[PDB]
Design an enzyme around this catalytic site. Structure first.
Site, short mmCIF file in Angstrom:
data_model
loop_
_atom_site.label_atom_id
_atom_site.label_comp_id
_atom_site.label_asym_id
_atom_site.label_seq_id
_atom_site.Cartn_x
_atom_site.Cartn_y
_atom_site.Cartn_z
N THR B 12 -62.99 42.90 -84.56
CA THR B 12 -63.10 42.72 -83.12
C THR B 12 -63.99 43.80 -82.52
OG1 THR B 12 -60.77 43.25 -83.42
CG2 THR B 12 -61.31 41.41 -81.94
N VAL B 14 -67.34 44.24 -82.31
CA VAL B 14 -68.51 44.71 -83.04
C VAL B 14 -69.81 44.20 -82.44
CG1 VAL B 14 -67.28 45.19 -85.17
CG2 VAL B 14 -68.14 42.89 -84.77
N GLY B 15 -69.74 43.34 -81.43
CA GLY B 15 -70.90 42.83 -80.75
C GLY B 15 -71.37 41.45 -81.17
N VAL B 18 -73.04 39.68 -78.08
CA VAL B 18 -74.37 40.19 -77.75
C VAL B 18 -75.38 39.77 -78.80
CG1 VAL B 18 -75.58 42.18 -76.78
CG2 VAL B 18 -73.13 42.16 -76.86
N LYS B 38 -68.18 28.52 -78.83
CA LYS B 38 -67.07 29.46 -78.91
C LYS B 38 -65.83 28.60 -78.73
CE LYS B 38 -64.91 33.69 -78.10
NZ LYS B 38 -65.03 34.98 -78.83
N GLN B 41 -61.46 30.87 -76.83
CA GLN B 41 -61.64 32.10 -76.07
C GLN B 41 -60.30 32.63 -75.57
OE1 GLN B 41 -64.85 33.83 -74.43
NE2 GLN B 41 -63.16 35.31 -74.57
N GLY B 145 -66.70 53.57 -92.41
CA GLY B 145 -65.89 52.44 -92.77
C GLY B 145 -66.63 51.12 -92.80
N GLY B 200 -75.60 49.61 -75.57
CA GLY B 200 -75.68 49.30 -74.16
C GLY B 200 -76.53 48.09 -73.82
N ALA B 202 -75.76 45.11 -73.97
CA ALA B 202 -74.98 44.07 -73.32
C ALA B 202 -75.07 44.14 -71.80
CB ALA B 202 -73.52 44.18 -73.77
#
Ligand SMILES: O=c1ccn([C@@H]2O[C@H](COP(=O)(O)OP(=O)(O)OP(=O)(O)O)[C@@H](O)[C@H]2O)c(=O)[nH]1
Ligand SMILES: O=c1ccn([C@@H]2O[C@H](COP(=O)(O)OP(=O)(O)OP(=O)(O)O)[C@@H](O)[C@H]2O)c(=O)[nH]1
Ligand SMILES: [Mg+2]
Ligand SMILES: [Mg+2]
Lengths: 227, 226
Positions: B12, B14-15, B18, B38, B41, B145, B200, B202
């Site tokens: 969750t 991670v973009g 975008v 999608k 949602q 990670g 940034g 987004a």
């Protein structure tokens, strides 16, 4: 030989070390002889030392390392940064094989999560577990994302026929929340949940830790780990 | 049809949205027709709406969803909080194939990681990708990670014969740092890095976003998708 458990996790900083000190302490109080092993240790230049912390918390004396690297990064990158090499696969397997004794639980903590490279080329804790025929204890979070990462790891183990010994929630908040509670309930549906160590368990002194450890695990599952 | 890409990620936040918007915006400026699906949602109480994010940033109008849940939880737990079920597998797969047409890039965003439950009972974006014969674009971080989480996601894709379209770094930091810079070279060794979106991105207006997006991807690769 005895009983070898690799203690992996869904990533870095999920409680692997504290789970090692906790299961060791519980095993010890049950009569089991316990060795704890950390073949690859990064971040020593910031004072990271998981072996030393496992002894600090559980009083384990039988503590085996091999490779150490100053920078807190992936072993591959930590090693290349210091102009050093990663250990060979057979050096890791030998380090563990030497600890293995009948009636002893040997615990092996990885670096970060299951597929982090520990030896060239691309050798992971999963391969080591295959070589010494170990089972894997998977330390997980209660935070969101945990289910995706837990199932990704359980799938990775089963693809190599590494048996899953179960899960340990490495930090548990007092009290939980809606996600934290739904995670736990959802975790316990695809795998057995051996423990849920109270958050901050890494600050308990000897007795509280030993008290926590004994209640944290089902005495029967521990004593049943090694005949 | 055309091309169907699932846009998954290692977790969750991670973009993925975008990146959907950036690839959409690059494919649109390449003259390619783009749809984004999608199906589920969550977090509609706090205003989450990934398709509207994509509409704004990228200009896509073919924007398809099947279910919206108020609580900011994984779909299954949000469905359970609301007393109602997740959509069914047949709905999600058919919605996507009905979107798919020749000449069109169709991007599918699930929720969180590859294996989170997306439809009833316990079906994932991976199963959806299998059924529609989609490849997977894998959105990643450059934070400590990411190599474990990336190798795990690629392994799970390959285990079900879902082809890897490459990796995208959802947020490239300024300035990098040794861990992020090291992690990018290691990621390039495990698969192609199609883009690394500046941090940034987004928040850019649609014209700025489209400029960034055109620069962020390789022209021939984007063209070759359809
Ligand atoms: O910023 C912080 C804050 C806290 N911590 C501390 O991390 C401890 C728990 O983290 P652990 O060290 O037990 O998890 P781990 O074994 O899986 O970690 P790695 O080998 O992969 O490195 C906790 O005691 C917590 O206070 C950090 O590491 N960083
Ligand atoms: O501290 C935080 C934590 C989380 N976030 C939130 O985390 C997310 C960051 O990133 P995204 O939510 O936009 O990427 P994504 O598409 O992969 O995520 P999902 O569809 O699966 O939900 C955004 O929802 C952001 O608002 C923060 O902004 N700050
Ligand atoms: Mg540790
Ligand atoms: Mg999103």
């Amino acid at each position: 030989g005895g009983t070898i458990l690799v203690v992996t996790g869904t990533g870095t900083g999920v409680g692997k070390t504290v789970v090692c000190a906790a299961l060791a302490s519980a095993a010890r109080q049950a009569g089991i002889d316990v060795a704890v092993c950390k073949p690859v240790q990064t971040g020593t230049a910031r004072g990271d030392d998981d072996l030393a912390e496992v002894g600090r918390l559980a009083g384990v004396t039988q503590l085996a390392g091999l490779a150490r690297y100053p920078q807190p990064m992936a072993p591959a990158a930590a090693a290349e940064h210091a102009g050093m090499a990663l250990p060979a696969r057979d050096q890791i397997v030998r380090l563990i094989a030497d600890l293995d004794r009948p009636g002893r639980l040997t615990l092996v903590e990885g670096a970060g999560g299951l597929l982090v490279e520990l030896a060239e080329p691309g050798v992971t804790l999963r391969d080591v577990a295959v070589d010494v025929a170990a089972a894997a204890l998977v330390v997980v979070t209660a935070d969101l994302g945990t289910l995706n990462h837990t199932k990704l790891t359980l799938e990775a183990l089963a693809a190599q026929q590494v048996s899953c010994a179960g899960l340990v929630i490495g930090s548990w908040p007092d009290p939980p929340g809606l996600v934290a509670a739904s995670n736990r309930s959802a975790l316990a549906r695809i795998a057995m949940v051996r423990a849920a160590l109270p958050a901050g368990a890494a600050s308990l002194d000897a007795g509280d830790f030993a008290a926590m450890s004994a209640a944290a695990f089902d005495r029967n599952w521990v004593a049943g780990l090694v005949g």
